[PDB]
Amino acid sequence: PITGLVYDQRMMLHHNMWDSHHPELPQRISRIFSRHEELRLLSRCHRIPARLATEEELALCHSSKHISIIKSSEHMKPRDLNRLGDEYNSIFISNESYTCALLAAGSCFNSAQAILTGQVRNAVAIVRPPGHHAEKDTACGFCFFNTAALTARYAQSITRESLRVLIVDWDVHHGNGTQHIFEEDDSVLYISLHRYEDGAFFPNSEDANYDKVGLGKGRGYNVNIPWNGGKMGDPEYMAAFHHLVMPIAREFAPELVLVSAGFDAARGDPLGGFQVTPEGYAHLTHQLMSLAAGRVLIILEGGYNLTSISESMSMCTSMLLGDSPPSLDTPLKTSATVSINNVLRAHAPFWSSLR
Numbered sequence: 271p272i273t274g275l276v277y278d279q280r281m282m283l284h285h286n287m288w289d290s291h292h293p294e295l296p297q298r299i300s301r302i303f304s305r306h307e308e309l310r311l312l313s314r315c316h317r318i319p320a321r322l323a324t325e326e327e328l329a330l331c332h333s334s335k336h337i338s339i340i341k342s343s344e345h346m347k348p349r350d351l352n353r354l355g356d357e358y359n360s361i362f363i364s365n366e367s368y369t370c371a372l373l374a375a376g377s378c379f380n381s382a383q384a385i386l387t388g389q390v391r392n393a394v395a396i397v398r399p400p401g402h403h404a405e406k407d408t409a410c411g412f413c414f415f416n417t418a419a420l421t422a423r424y425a426q427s428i429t430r431e432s433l434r435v436l437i438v439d440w441d442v443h444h445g446n447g448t449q450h451i452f453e454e455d456d457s458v459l460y461i462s463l464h465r466y467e468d469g470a471f472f473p474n475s476e477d478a479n480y481d482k483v484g485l486g487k488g489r490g491y492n493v494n495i496p497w498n499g500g501k502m503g504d505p506e507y508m509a510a511f512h513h514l515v516m517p518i519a520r521e522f523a524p525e526l527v528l529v530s531a532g533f534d535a536a537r538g539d540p541l542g543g544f545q546v547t548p549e550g551y552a553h554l555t556h557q558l559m560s561l562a563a564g565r566v567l568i569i570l571e572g573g574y575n576l577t578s579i580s581e582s583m584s585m586c587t588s589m590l591l592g593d594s595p596p597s598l599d600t601p602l603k604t605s606a607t608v609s610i611n612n613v614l615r616a617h618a619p620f621w622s623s624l625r
């Protein structure tokens with residue numbers, strides 16, 4: 271029952287040349303790593319090395335032109351970095367950004383390989399920049415390449431094309447890129463919980479609503495759980511898992527679970543406005559560990575309170591290592607009941623576990 275951990279300080283080099291306080295900070299990953307040492311988790315893990323994804327591995331999900339554009343930024347002067355970055359929704363670029371995005375993906379590929387070949391049972395990937403907003407053909411929302419989507423395809427490339435991969439995306443934002451990549455795919459089940467606010471919260475698209483269930487043979491394999499009008503936390507996330515995430519995931523019977531684990535829904539996050547606790551994230555991790563024979567890979571996405579993300583992600587690793595889960599409690603906010611029931615009705619036709 272070995273737990274793997276991948277972290278490489280080099281991923282700190284991606285930075286914002288124009289705003290030292292921009293929340294997607296280099297030290298997001300170093301602080302999470304430090305907390306693993308401070309709590310004596312690091313020495314309990316098997317250290318998986320980082321590596322660069324290849325351009326051909328990026329082609330598992332991304333266009334040749336998109337790869338070339340981000341690749342070219344390694345050599346741009348600040349004026350061109352500014353202008354290129356501004357062509358996307360919510361992107362800053364430095365000369366190190368391409369290499370950091372390659373390291374984040376390659377790290378996750380090595381973690382998936384270690385799990386699927388039985389070298390470790392589960393793993394955590396402390397990586398930046400994030401991935402879940404990146405589309406096949408564009409960067410978006412701090413993300414250059416879709417690390418989680420690429421890891422699902424990489425996992426399939428080294429196993430079989432029909433490998434059943436579950437992606438649970440608990441970042442406070444909808445993973446538009448991940449949804450779109452797998453929207454017509456019945457081999458990758460995408461489940462997102464996210465603040466939505468009737469389309470008003472980033473990334474500001476009705477694609478994140480509950481009635482988007484997938485397309486074609488993918489119908490039923492895209493599960494959006496959108497929150498509106500409330501400061502959601504442990505009660506609402508635990509109820510979403512109990513009524514939705516776990517029954518669906520158990521019926522799907524994945525062979526590999528990837529977590530797009532942003533910690534921006536955490537209590538204390540300056541952007542998310544939510545109040546999930548570190549014990550709440552530990553609960554969610556422990557629930558997912560009952561799937562896929564425990565084959566869970568936790569991939570950092572967003573999360574901007576350094577203290578909050580460090581404690582939260584460390585608690586997830588504690589669960590992966592087999593430590594006893596914390597006990598949690600307790601009325602939901604009323605709009606969360608509405609949201610959950612809206613998803614249930616959208617997905618009851620496709621999942622017998624919901625009937």
Ligand SMILES: O=C(NO)c1ccc(CN(Cc2cccnc2)S(=O)(=O)C2CCCC2)cc1
Nearest residue numbers: 360411412441443472532534541542571572573
């Ligand atoms: O975490 C993420 N994804 O997983 C994430 C992705 C993108 C952003 C960008 N921001 C939007 C925002 C603000 C508050 C809360 N959520 C999102 S923004 O910086 O304000 C940008 C908008 C237009 C001008 C600046 C932030 C987080």
Ligand SMILES: [K+]
Nearest residue numbers: 439441443463
């Ligand atoms: K999400």
Ligand SMILES: [K+]
Nearest residue numbers: 452455458491
């Ligand atoms: K899908």
Ligand SMILES: [Zn+2]
Nearest residue numbers: 441443534572
């Ligand atoms: Zn986010």
